[PDB]
Design an enzyme around this catalytic site. Structure first.
Site, PDB file in Angstrom:
ATOM      1  N   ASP A 122       2.262   3.139   5.583  1.00 30.53           N
ATOM      2  CA  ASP A 122       1.505   1.909   5.702  1.00 30.53           C
ATOM      3  C   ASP A 122       1.915   0.980   4.570  1.00 30.53           C
ATOM      4  O   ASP A 122       1.933  -0.254   4.705  1.00 30.53           O
ATOM      5  CB  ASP A 122      -0.016   2.151   5.639  1.00 30.53           C
ATOM      6  CG  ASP A 122      -0.734   2.785   6.817  1.00 30.53           C
ATOM      7  OD1 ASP A 122      -0.178   3.349   7.744  1.00 30.53           O
ATOM      8  OD2 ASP A 122      -1.969   2.767   6.892  1.00 30.53           O
ATOM      9  N   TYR A 129      14.339  -1.000  16.907  1.00 26.81           N
ATOM     10  CA  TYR A 129      15.584  -0.845  16.155  1.00 26.81           C
ATOM     11  C   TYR A 129      16.386   0.280  16.800  1.00 26.81           C
ATOM     12  O   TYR A 129      15.892   0.926  17.732  1.00 26.81           O
ATOM     13  CB  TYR A 129      15.306  -0.525  14.676  1.00 26.81           C
ATOM     14  CG  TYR A 129      14.379   0.654  14.436  1.00 26.81           C
ATOM     15  CD1 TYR A 129      14.834   1.934  14.610  1.00 26.81           C
ATOM     16  CD2 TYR A 129      13.071   0.416  14.094  1.00 26.81           C
ATOM     17  CE1 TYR A 129      13.969   2.994  14.526  1.00 26.81           C
ATOM     18  CE2 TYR A 129      12.196   1.482  13.986  1.00 26.81           C
ATOM     19  CZ  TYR A 129      12.656   2.749  14.221  1.00 26.81           C
ATOM     20  OH  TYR A 129      11.822   3.832  14.164  1.00 26.81           O
ATOM     21  N   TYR A 136       5.417  -0.509   5.567  1.00 27.80           N
ATOM     22  CA  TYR A 136       5.209  -1.636   6.448  1.00 27.80           C
ATOM     23  C   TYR A 136       4.689  -2.883   5.792  1.00 27.80           C
ATOM     24  O   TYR A 136       5.116  -3.983   6.166  1.00 27.80           O
ATOM     25  CB  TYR A 136       4.296  -1.275   7.583  1.00 27.80           C
ATOM     26  CG  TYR A 136       4.983  -0.525   8.725  1.00 27.80           C
ATOM     27  CD1 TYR A 136       6.176   0.165   8.587  1.00 27.80           C
ATOM     28  CD2 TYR A 136       4.339  -0.516   9.927  1.00 27.80           C
ATOM     29  CE1 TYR A 136       6.706   0.872   9.641  1.00 27.80           C
ATOM     30  CE2 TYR A 136       4.873   0.176  10.977  1.00 27.80           C
ATOM     31  CZ  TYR A 136       6.029   0.875  10.831  1.00 27.80           C
ATOM     32  OH  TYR A 136       6.439   1.609  11.923  1.00 27.80           O
TER      33      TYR A 136
HETATM   34 CA    CA Z   1      -2.294   3.565   8.870  1.00 28.43          CA
END
Ligand code: CA
Ligand code: CA
Lengths: 123, 123
Positions: free
Chosen positions: B49, B73, B52
């Site tokens: 997380d 991708y 990201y």
């Molecule tokens: Ca998460």
């Protein structure tokens, strides 16, 4: 897969735009192909066209109604080698392998300028 | 990419359906995540997380208006290892790498049954 085949040849031949450089070369590199291959590059193209014909007869291929040119599969390029992914269905994997062998063939054979835009009068 | 991340974890953990087994686990594995990771699996999820979040601040990512979960991708799985492809744009490659590290983390850590469907009362 056209977009993946283009990428595969660039993996092997980084200085190329394969859709330009390898399209309409000889009797086989490009849409169709008939006649005797004019050189070994064109013969790579004949083998790949036969690999697609064989892919087409396969039981698994009879579903994905995306001709082998839009049927997408998964592969990697790293360190200039191509790996077809275990994630591919049997049709996708067969096509990934046709593409991989052709990209490798194209990098190992002479390119003959005089056979590009070859007039089809004797293919 | 969600479809590719699922595939990546299956590459590492072939007996899993990752979208079932790893979704809503702990405080971080799943949509969002807040609080202290409940174990090392959940901590893999917190790192992913954050990977990201970092991907989101990148200049290259500011274009592909497909949140990292639908931004596709290219990668390979072969012999149970994941390779991110050189064909990826800078955003795609960064995300492929977040996914690859998380899949690898998930395979090396304990799975705790008691933290699945963890009630968020103290995340
Ligand atoms: Ca998460
Ligand atoms: Ca042809």
């Amino acid at each position: 897969a056209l977009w993946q085949f283009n990428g595969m040849i660039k993996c092997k031949i980084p200085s190329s735009e394969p859709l330009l450089d390898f399209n309409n070369y000889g009797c086989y590199c490009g849409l169709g192909g008939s006649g005797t291959p004019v050189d070994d590059l064109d013969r790579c193209c004949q083998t790949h066209d036969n690999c697609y014909k064989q892919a087409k007869k396969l039981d698994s291929c009879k579903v994905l109604v995306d001709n082998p040119y839009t049927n997408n599969y998964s592969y990697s390029c790293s360190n200039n080698e191509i790996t077809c992914s275990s994630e591919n269905n049997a049709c996708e994997a067969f096509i990934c392998n046709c593409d991989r062998n052709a990209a490798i063939c194209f990098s190992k054979v002479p390119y003959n300028k005089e056979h590009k835009n070859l007039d089809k009068k004797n293919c």
